[PDB]
Design a protein around this ligand. Structure first.
Ligand SMILES: Nc1ncnc2c1ncn2[C@@H]1O[C@H](CSCC[C@H](N)C(=O)O)[C@@H](O)[C@H]1O
Ligand SMILES: COC/C=C/c1ccc(O)c(OC)c1
Ligand SMILES: COc1cc(/C=C/CO)ccc1O
Lengths: 354, 360
């Protein structure tokens, strides 16, 4: 259509890049995904020492004519903290920074699958219909934007149609469990002392329970859930629906990154069922986010937590709860006391006593 | 692996999530613009409760809890504030000046342009493009063209007036602010000029401010026909000429200005054009000057970690959809030398950018 003092103009001019940085956030996603697609971290690691740009391009099957673009991509990734670069000719050479441990294929805790899963069309595309879903009232409505953009299908049904996407999700969860469980049994050692049995609800391939069982040789761990499963003498598996099937009895019931996927109604119903079972008393163990906890209250951590809340809002049916929200559920479910112990990775352990 | 190493890696993991979940920032901001949140709150005139805000955005009351969560995200990003009254009430933060429709410097169009399918999608073919040789005939100058059946962006703009309008409006909004900073912080750069050609000057926001601030300077914006045939800034000492800077003669002037233009293009055509400017700027023994309003990637004014992060993000954006980069001082100085220039001066302006005066 048709078509301020200097100090104010400069201030506003200088404020723009903060906005650009926000709306160009997808550039971080896509640059990281490229690094993974190209196996950059692995190729550098295989080299065994800093690798010159030309040799890196060659190993990546990037034409020498495009090495300058590879160089710019590396500069971005160095800034993100994955790699380092130096110029040994008076021609950059690249090596690994500590954050790259999380990209290496050889590490069972690498984040490759979660990355591919997270930036997949399945999870990004629905956001272009988020405004419409938000404005949809109650027969065109769906539980979330994901379903809104997948003809009514929630993520679990889409997982059953898309084996690759499903595999990425599971591998991504398994990778996190590898690291989280090792931090959990160390940071929260006292929470496992005294137990003879634990049920790991949504425990999947048993990565969490394997570590508990190996660390605390007297705990009989049972994974209760809907690749080959981890083996341990004190680790077994039971098939079931946590919402509509009865949870096996044990000294402790564990929910690792599970309750965050669901809204208060089905969570409360399940907790009430857990309170009945756990009562001689056992205890509830929740390894998950307490959004406003002191241990993750710094702005960087809060930013990432809130980003997860948005991610979950779009494709799951849960959220990252505050202590107040958790405490209300515990109270309503009939539990009497809880104790929070920080673990790491934005998450804590909540022990809840019936 | 000992426990301490496991905890350290577990605590480093969220940095990675934050990286790959970057698009959530993009999409939450775009939602805020789609929903007109800033404008609706501003029009309300004072902090607005959650339930009233839902109604004002035509979000059903049953979806208010989701709106609350989106606002919590946007408050953290710094666009809005939550005002404590004892439901949450919401108000505007300083950053929201850049979202309001009534401000001629708002960043709405640039945001929509930037997160558009045209610019996001080619990234899913970046690895394939990087691995493409100039032999099997599938090569293109960048991933954008690779993903657009060989079409480059300024071609897509001449054919797609909507996306094109987003991009030119986006540039205009920045120019509105940048030009006001420029004439203030670099006032001396305009001394003694009687003419200036703003090459790729768009819809004239830059030259309009130059012309008003420096009455002796006749300003000519030189851009493509589809950019300067519509509404644009007007002034008695400002006019527009159309053409292609690579194939047509640039208008003669005491100063040649490139604002956010040289960064779109690779060294070879940039050098050729700078050589042309050096010749033009030294005709008949009299010397003009070259002015570049652009990124100097390693300049002190944008050397901090946050600024550098945004510069490199732009370098990536430009790599995908343009044919240029954010050049370091080393890269610029080499071009100046090869083009035949004899001196330069760099003065910071703002928004990651500087003025380079280049003298023949
Ligand atoms: N071949 C060409 N000849 C002249 N202008 C061109 C061109 N190719 C692209 N452009 C123009 O260069 C500009 C780049 S974006 C910069 C616009 C303006 N200087 C500003 O800073 O706000 C666009 O207006 C685009 O239309
Ligand atoms: C010659 O044009 C320079 C382009 C600058 C630009 C800056 C930020 C953007 O988001 C963006 O997205 C389109 C473009
Ligand atoms: C699909 O991508 C993600 C999923 C989760 C889910 C956690 C608990 O269900 C956490 C982080 C991610 O990036």
């Amino acid at each position: 259509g048709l078509v301020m003092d200097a100090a104010t103009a400069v201030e506003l001019l200088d404020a723009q890049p903060q906005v650009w940085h926000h709306f160009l956030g997808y550039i971080n996603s896509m640059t990281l995904q490229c690094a993974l697609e190209l196996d950059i971290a692995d190729v550098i690691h295989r080299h065994g020492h800093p690798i010159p740009l030309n040799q890196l391009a060659a190993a990546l099957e990037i034409p020498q004519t495009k090495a300058p673009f590879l160089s710019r991509l590396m500069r971005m990734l160095v800034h993100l903290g994955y790699f380092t670069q130096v110029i040994t000719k008076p021609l950059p050479s690249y090596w690994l920074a500590p954050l790259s441990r999380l990209l290496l294929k050889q590490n069972p805790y690498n984040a490759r699958s979660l990355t591919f899963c997270s930036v997949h069309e399945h999870l990004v595309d629905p956001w272009r219909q988020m405004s419409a879903w938000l404005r949809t009232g109650k027969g065109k409505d769906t539980p979330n934007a994901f379903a809104f953009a997948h003809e009514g299908k929630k993520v679990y049904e889409v997982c059953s149609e898309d084996a690759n996407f499903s595999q990425l999700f599971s591998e991504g969860m398994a990778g996190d469990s590898w690291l989280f469980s090792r931090a959990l049994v160390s940071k929260c050692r006292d929470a496992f002392e005294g137990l003879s049995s634990l049920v790991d609800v949504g425990g999947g391939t048993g990565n969490t329970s394997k570590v508990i069982a190996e660390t605390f040789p007297n705990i009989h761990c049972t994974v209760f859930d809907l690749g080959p499963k981890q083996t341990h003498p004190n680790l077994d598996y039971e098939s079931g629906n946590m919402f509509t099937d009865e949870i096996p009895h044990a000294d402790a019931v564990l929910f690792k990154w599970v309750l965050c996927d669901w809204p208060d109604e089905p969570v409360l119903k399940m907790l009430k069922q857990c309170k009945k079972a756990l009562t001689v008393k056992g205890k509830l163990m929740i390894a998950d986010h307490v959004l406003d906890h002191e241990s993750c209250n710094d702005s960087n951590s809060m930013g990432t937590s809130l980003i997860l809340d948005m991610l979950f809002m779009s494709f799951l049916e849960g959220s990252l709860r505050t202590e107040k929200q958790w405490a209300k559920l515990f109270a309503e479910a009939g539990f009497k006391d809880y104790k929070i112990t920080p673990v790491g990775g934005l998450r804590v352990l909540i022990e809840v006593y019936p």
